[PDB]
Design a protein around this ligand. Structure first.
Ligand SMILES: Nc1ncnc2c1ncn2[C@@H]1O[C@H](COP(=O)(O)OP(=O)(O)OP(=O)(O)O)[C@@H](O)[C@H]1O
Ligand SMILES: Nc1ncnc2c1ncn2[C@@H]1O[C@H](COP(=O)(O)OP(=O)(O)OP(=O)(O)O)[C@@H](O)[C@H]1O
Ligand SMILES: Nc1ncnc2c1ncn2[C@@H]1O[C@H](COP(=O)(O)OP(=O)(O)OP(=O)(O)O)[C@@H](O)[C@H]1O
Ligand SMILES: [Mg+2]
Ligand SMILES: [Mg+2]
Ligand SMILES: [Mg+2]
Lengths: 353, 354, 353
């Protein structure tokens, strides 16, 4: 029946986030978080292998067959780019494919508050975009980087596994290195990045202690560094970074973070109240002198109280404060807002007042 | 006399849990926990090798002869699936085979309380199914996963060594990866699972620090994660997870567990008082705000007191409370209930209270 | 002169425990702990090599010649089984051989108290048989396992280096794996033993931290686990197990031990007062609720006081209490009892009262 080109076109046309191909099921697309099967016969092992192999190079095929795992990205001219993962289950090939649009949407289209636009103007520091899997983090990062590319005459370097969004040069020089092709690893790229005269660097996830140290060094040496974590809040993000280090070296890490941290964004995507589309809920922490002191004084938990009152001055916003605003504008239902609040009793109190 | 197909048929027909093949003994089938020898001549070394090799591929035969060890699963069309272990003792092949039915029983048939069915509706978090060896853990997990498969339109990924229960697609997309064939290892499968757009993940036993960290990460990144441990209670399960980490990092592990933990099930299978069959005894801990606080404040022991009074509100149940109910229903004898109670004095108090 | 078959027959016939073959000495047999030379010419290097090689397979000969060390067991039909060790000294082969009877003696013949028979009825837990080298530990373990084999319909697995006592099936299924032939190592056997549906497992000596963790896991997962240590008392045994772990993880180990421990037996073999044969002296600790609390409370030393008064209720017995009974029945002399008491002044006090 349908070939890979038609399946990916249907994924794009229907606003799906992921296309799933596996044996004994028809192709399925995730729309607004939920899977929907396409009106097609179920695939067999011949189908899944042929469809997934149709978008691989010969080197990628040999590589997938050596490990039964493969991450990759590819483009279909005139349609979209895609991030693919291919694996093996029950002795057969399976694949998942995520849409990466060629055109980056704006801050207001993505539902990002104006403070996120101001983060794109920071000359230096560490900006963290956090949240659960598939919560819009790469899309937010692409919007920020596109703004920098538009407005600055600086050098942007990204290190990606794989490269997702493409950034053609506007006013910046943008260099994008793909792990496994352009560079051997994140570690090898970071070993030479300081000799490449960067101004803005995207390093991906802060996956281990070595990557955290690289990001802290980048942010301390006069660069604007963007990174991601899978944490769910500003406080949880700061604690996660500090606590990976041995107890005797955590004082320095807290001091470094207090100096270089310029923003923490924690995102989630919620189903809209209408039943179509998803809306962004975001917690924003922008450090002020009080928050930087709390970090140095090892009073990280008290940062949440500072965020509750930093709305007008610094554009800060707790997750519950964002859910409150989404509820008053009727963008989400009460069940969705409550089922997502990190503290439902606090959000209840905010409602009853 | 009998061939492997006939021996596995008797295993299934008799409701046994395991078939044992070893030299100088007839085939034996474990029924309700106790071995029963079949009315057959004892096997010799030729018999044990031939019977076990009849259910192996040539690649599996080569690997078994390379290591004198082998785990595997296989199916017999129209009968059942089986998990097998082949080994060598006294210079001869030996084998044990566990039944894996094609049909997944319901919560009611398995003796699982209604709170277990509500765990299958959880959209995120960490659910732990614990207990001793052969206590029904994989069967409970299959029942929960079959319920999710029936009710949700989500992506379920399992990593198994080997794959036991097979889950055909219902309303979910179900991908099942077998270690050693589909994926190199648990570690390699977990290295890529976040790029496979999952909603529900089965990771197997929390074998080491690395697997615990993977399961905690899965649970906090928006997924429903199922895993097993060989601990015997909810409190012992929480302590086991925290205590594997260095002392300075246990605070973060306790904070993570307090956020993501959605359920701990600890099971044991007991012989029925009727003499035929076994009955499930299960301790259920479902975190409420009080328990999550106790985890963060490093007061894990005080969780047991919360479970004693959380029956009506949250469906919680200590093991002794489950044993009490089984005794009231006359499913088990007093000796069996007392002999398996983790605190016989408490169960005695509960019985002679009124 | 005499061949290996005749030397091993003389070892069996004279009730010896070990036969020694080395150059410039006649064959010597250990009877009741003391060596006695046989009335034969001294052996040379040709003799020792020929005698020891007569009981080796070709693979064992190549193996011994590669390492100058070899542990093994073998049987002589109609006579006995034997555990052998072959080594090299002064450029020549030497060998020691221990008798392993085909018929396992009963509890009363071995001098084991009735509480040891009750340990064979335990459904689950950890049972430790401890004592110095050659103190009867394997023989006690074989008697317990034979009782389980007789009375239960369960699965017994032993891991041995090498297999000593053979256990033909009675009511149990008994599988015995020899390290270096049936299984690669203790570690590899223990890696798969939980997938082999065992009920009772013999794991040998708790030689390292990894083996202790395996035994604690077996005893906690619904199995009856038997293991040995070379400790001399119940308290010394418990302390040895806990103290091998780092200080931060000892709380869990004490908690595990308090849950799974079902018995500690510490044996010694003493020469009989008549001058012929040896008699077993044994310290028995069976945990009661008080002892299990002392383990959790890190009050291990106070367990000895509980054993002094647990004779009638739980069948417990300190080593000195056993020596006291052996002295009143005139089984041992005062010098032997005192020369063996771990606290001679306590045994003195028990005598003068
Ligand atoms: N602000 C947003 N509002 C609504 N939908 C969004 C938003 N941002 C991203 N999405 C959609 O969510 C899906 C995931 O996008 P994206 O890959 O950028 O997030 P992610 O956290 O980086 O995913 P992953 O964890 O796999 O790397 C996409 O389909 C995207 O169109
Ligand atoms: N609720 C139950 N009630 C009665 N019997 C059960 C129940 N659950 C499982 N069993 C039976 O117990 C035996 C073991 O089942 P299962 O393999 O699922 O447990 P397990 O703990 O995962 O075993 P293992 O430790 O080897 O992985 C099977 O024969 C099964 O039919
Ligand atoms: N209860 C007993 N009474 C008298 N003699 C015994 C008793 N048990 C064992 N023996 C004898 O002591 C000798 C050693 O026996 P055994 O090998 O079982 O002890 P062991 O501690 O396991 O030795 P090793 O440390 O070398 O492994 C044998 O000759 C045996 O016959
Ligand atoms: Mg991304
Ligand atoms: Mg299982
Ligand atoms: Mg021994």
């Amino acid at each position: 029946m349908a070939n890979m080109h038609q399946l990916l076109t249907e994924l794009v046309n229907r606003g799906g986030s992921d296309l799933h191909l596996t044996t004994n099921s028809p192709p399925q697309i995730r729309i607004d978080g939920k899977l929907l099967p396409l009106d097609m016969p179920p695939l067999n092992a011949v189908d899944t292998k042929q469809l997934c192999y149709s978008i691989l190079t010969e080197q990628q095929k040999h590589k997938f067959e050596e490990n039964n795992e493969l991450d990759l990205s590819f483009g279909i001219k005139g349609l979209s780019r895609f991030r693919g993962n291919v694996f093996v289950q029950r002795g057969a090939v399976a694949g998942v494919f995520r849409v990466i649009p060629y055109k980056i949407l704006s801050f207001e289209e993505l539902g990002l508050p104006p403070v996120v636009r101001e983060l794109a103007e920071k000359p230096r520091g560490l900006v963290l975009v956090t949240g659960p899997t598939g919560s819009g983090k790469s899309t937010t990062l692409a919007a920020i980087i596109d703004k920098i590319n538009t407005d600055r005459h600086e050098h942007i370097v990204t290190v990606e596994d794989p490269i997702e969004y493409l950034h053609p040069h506007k006013s910046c020089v943008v260099n994008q290195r793909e792990v496994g092709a352009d560079t051997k690893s994140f570690k090898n790229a970071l070993k030479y990045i300081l000799r490449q005269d960067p101004d803005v660097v995207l390093v991906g996830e802060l996956r281990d202690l070595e990557t955290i140290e690289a990001a802290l060094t980048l942010a301390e040496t006069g660069h604007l560094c963007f990174a991601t974590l899978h944490t769910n809040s500003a406080v949880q993000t700061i604690n996660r970074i500090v606590d990976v280090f041995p107890s005797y070296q955590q004082p320095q890490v807290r001091a470094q973070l207090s100096f270089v941290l310029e923003g923490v964004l924690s995102q989630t995507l919620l189903p809209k109240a209408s039943g179509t589309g998803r809306v962004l809920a975001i917690e924003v922490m922008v450090p002020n002198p009080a928050i930087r002191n709390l970090i140095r004084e090892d009073k990280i938990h008290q940062i949440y109280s500072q965020m509750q009152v930093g709305q007008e001055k610094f554009g800060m916003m707790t997750m519950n404060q964002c859910l409150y605003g989404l509820l008053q504008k009727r963008h989400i239902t009460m069940d969705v807002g409550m089922g997502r609040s990190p503290d439902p009793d606090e959000l209840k109190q905010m409602l009853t007042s």
